[PDB]
Amino acid sequence: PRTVMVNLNIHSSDYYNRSTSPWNLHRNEDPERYPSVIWEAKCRHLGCINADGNVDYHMNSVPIQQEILVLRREPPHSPNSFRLEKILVSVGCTCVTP
Amino acid sequence: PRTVMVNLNIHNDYYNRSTSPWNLHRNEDPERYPSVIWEAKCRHLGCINADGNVDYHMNSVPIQQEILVLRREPPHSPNSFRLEKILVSVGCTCVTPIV
Ligand SMILES: CC(F)(F)c1nnc(N[C@H](c2cn3ncc([C@@H](C4CC4)N4C[C@@H](C(F)(F)F)NC4=O)cc3n2)C2CCC(F)(F)CC2)o1
């Protein structure tokens, strides 16, 4: 264990609507985790929006997955003690050539 | 102060075909945890078309997200931190510019 003290008191999105692989945000909630709420990107379409403004299936919208560190309550249900943990979160969508 | 204890011992390529591909840039700060953060930098100003050529009628833009980091408090402290928000680039997407 490398135990440290953390003080939790801390001292654009509408532009991504113009993406050829647009996404919406999905609420992910876990009361055993900090941050408990994580907004996860879900691609709106299987294809990408082409020059005509239409969904084109010759290209694919794919979620960008990132490794994210979160705090897991340790022991479970502990309000003040945690262990660092890695999870995968979707942070947006990009358009790929299959 | 909302002081909590954190155990820092972690429990636990595809996007190359993107029309708005990106590379990773090393962001290092010895006063922060994680000290090293890899940020996405868009490879091109435009988006890659069907022919494999850059088209400047569209733009590759970095997706900026707010993430939480630990700042050493007091400075240089090996075991005490304050939570802090920073803005990082987590990938690139292709956008149709405003006309
Ligand atoms: C909104 C949220 F997703 F819940 C969220 N916000 N911050 C976190 N987690 C915070 C957080 C910060 N980072 N910074 C870097 C990384 C690494 C991944 C290889 C491990 N990445 C991911 C990628 C990107 F950051 F650019 F995305 N590039 C990287 O180098 C993960 C990460 N996790 C977390 C909150 C608890 C804490 F303070 F104790 C510690 C830090 O989650």
Swiss-Prot record, chain A:
Keyword Signal part of the UniProt annotation: yes
Keywords: Adaptive immunity, Cytokine, Disulfide bond, Glycoprotein, Immunity, Inflammatory response, Innate immunity, Secreted, Signal
Gene Ontology terms: biological process: adaptive immune response; apoptotic process; cell death; cell-cell signaling; cellular response to interleukin-1; defense response to fungus; defense response to Gram-negative bacterium; defense response to Gram-positive bacterium
Chief location bin: secreted
Tissue expression profile of the protein: Expressed in memory Th17 cells (at protein level).
PTM entry text: N-glycosylated. Found both in glycosylated and nonglycosylated forms.
Mutation effect (residue 57 to I): Decreases the affinity for IL17RA
Top-level division of the source organism's lineage: Eukaryota
Family statement: Belongs to the IL-17 family.
Protein name: Interleukin-17A
